[PDB]
Design a protein around this ligand. Structure first.
Ligand SMILES: [Ca+2]
Ligand SMILES: [Zn+2]
Ligand SMILES: [Zn+2]
Ligand SMILES: [Zn+2]
Length: 84
């Protein structure tokens, strides 16, 4: 009766630069890994990455988290970045 982990985040945008606040957690265990796709061909295994887009646009950012039993969940959010 493992509970699958909770994937969640919020983005902070500053022109084309973005930072992630990671709210992911496991109610009954621990998170072991993080897999981000920034929607522009760039990816990360960091918990709370900072990145920058090279051009303005709307992108889908995805985060997959894994718990201590190997269960996963994915949450995605669109974001918009503009040149300053
Ligand atoms: Ca769990
Ligand atoms: Zn919770
Ligand atoms: Zn803990
Ligand atoms: Zn604007």
């Amino acid at each position: 009766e493992n509970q699958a982990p909770v994937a969640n985040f919020e983005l902070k945008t500053d022109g084309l630069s973005v930072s992630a606040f990671n709210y992911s957690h496991d109610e009954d265990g621990e998170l072991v890994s993080y897999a981000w796709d920034f929607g522009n061909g760039q990816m990360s295994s960091e918990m709370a990455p900072s990145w920058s887009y090279t051009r303005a646009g709307q992108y889908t950012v995805s985060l997959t988290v894994t718990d201590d039993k190997g269960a996963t969940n994915t949450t995605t959010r669109t974001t918009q970045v503009e040149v300053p």
